[PDB]
Amino acid sequence: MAVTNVAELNALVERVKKAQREYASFTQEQVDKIFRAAALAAADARIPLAKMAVAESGMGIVEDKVIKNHFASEYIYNAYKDEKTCGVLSEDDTGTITIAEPIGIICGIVPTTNPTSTAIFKSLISLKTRNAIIFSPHPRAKDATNKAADIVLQAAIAAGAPKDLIGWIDQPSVELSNALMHHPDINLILATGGPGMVKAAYSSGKPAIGVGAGNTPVVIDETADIKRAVASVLMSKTFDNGVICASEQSVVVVDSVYDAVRERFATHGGYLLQGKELKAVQDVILKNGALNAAIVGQPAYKIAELAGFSVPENTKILIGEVTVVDESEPFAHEKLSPTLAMYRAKDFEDAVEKAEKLVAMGGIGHTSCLYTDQDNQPARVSYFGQKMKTARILINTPASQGGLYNFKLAPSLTLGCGSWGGNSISENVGPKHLINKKTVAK
């Protein structure tokens, strides 16, 4: 049955409580069986769901969401397949038993950016650790997240799982979601998206972790490949219209090769702009005080029509030339759109300094890439890693992924932290943050 207001949420949550209480007694034998059936239905239902994940969202394209859904559905059943998360974990003779127990009902916020890629990831680690989730998607992409959750539910139902193990709200609202966070029966929150609601998630009096996204800078110096770094960044930013979290947000290049990039970008897929339209582009992404929701995931050309100036169809991304790095200029914040920021560096040393301020502006250090020659300049890469504060260091490597790239890299998501800022480094969320291990001593 559908839920309209808090009156029916305060009855939906009891069903999930009762299902979790009974599900906590399951052993490792039939917990992996439910894990198998849930992962298959997530992978086997990637295309249909991705087609209907853009019909009402209106942002992104179907082609890139197929790989994103497929990669996220199989990576979880690729490293967490066989690890003891139930019953006895270890045994120390010293008689020391280290059984583990789940946490319980889990809250989860699914953004409009990835309504289904992160909905099936969260749903697939909870039933591995014997806990339940309630999802609260955006009103723009509510129907896509609910279908993704229901597919995994029905897959788990015909595997030995209790009936009402996963829930969601229909026609949600800000006041309804607030009552879900303050409910005294939920003891975990998995918050994702921009700094719009994750700030409120931390200030909720409950344990919560946030899979955030900081503006990741890319540093290209004079010794790097100039015909190769132009394209690796170019294809990694057009991936799903640059909505994939922890994607590129700003490029920093030295003065030696600045003009060597400026004509190349306009040649291949970029369109630079310096007139009054640069101010228009700055104003077209701020409706009031923050990022607007009308240019997120849209192709480059249409936002130019809204900005006023005409841009040809073939163009891929648009890039501004801004030197100041502060709040008044909005070109440094996360944009989640196929746009890039190009910065001026007098040498390599100030390039890293100009990148520290960019990472700190995002609040959470997630990734940071540097493009340089890694064979005859090995000191620069070593120096580059001890100055930034990010969870991932990539050199000569695209931020998110390709379309024979590296395969054993965790997705851009599944990387959360536990604080807003103050030099915080993200970490990979897995079936250990949702589990509590107890020790008995004889």
Of 168 and 265, which has the nearer Cβ to another protein?
A: 265
* Position 395 contacts another protein (CB under 8 A): yes
Structure tokens at 225: 């490949």
Distance CA 117, CA 115 (A): 6
Q: What minimum distance in Å lies between the beta carbon of 207 and another protein? A: 4
**What is the footprint of another protein within residues 303-332 (CB under 8 A)?**
none
Count of residues that bind another protein according to CB under 8 A: 69
Question: How far is residue 360 from each of residues 177, 325, 388, 424, measured CA to CA in Å?
Answer: 30, 12, 9, 9
Of 187 and 223, which has the nearer Cβ to another protein?
A: 187
**What is the footprint of another protein within residues 212-251 (CB under 8 A)?**
227-228, 231-232, 234-235
SS3 call for 259:
helix
Binding string to another protein for residues 30 to 49, with x set by CB under 8 A, is what? ------xx-xx--xx-xx--
245 catalytic? Reply is yes
Distance CA 16, CA 104 (A): 10
The string of DSSP codes covering 388-409 is ---SEEEESS-SS-------S-
**What is the footprint of another protein within residues 407-426 (CB under 8 A)?**
407-409, 418-420, 422-425
* Residue 274, phi then psi, degrees to nearest 5: -135, -15
- Catalytic entry in 86, 245, 369, 417: 245
The string of DSSP codes covering 81-142 is SS---SS---EE---EE--EEE---EEE---SSSTTHHHHHHHHHHTTTT--EEE---GGGH
* Position 17 contacts another protein (CB under 8 A): no
* Residue 317, phi then psi, degrees to nearest 5: -135, 155
Q: What minimum distance in Å lies between the beta carbon of 323 and another protein? A: 27
Rg of the chain, C-alpha, whole Å: 23
Of 278 and 393, which has the nearer Cβ to another protein?
A: 393
In a 13 Å sphere around the CA of 303, the CA atoms on its Cβ side amount to 29
* Position 260 contacts another protein (CB under 8 A): no
**What is the footprint of another protein within residues 170-189 (CB under 8 A)?**
184, 187
Annotated catalytic sites, by residue? 245
Residues that bind another protein (CB under 8 A): 36-37, 39-40, 43-44, 46-47, 51, 62-63, 66, 70, 74, 77-78, 94, 97, 99, 101, 103-104, 184, 187, 202-203, 205-207, 227-228, 231-232, 234-235, 374, 381, 385, 389-398, 402-404, 406-409, 418-420, 422-425, 436-442
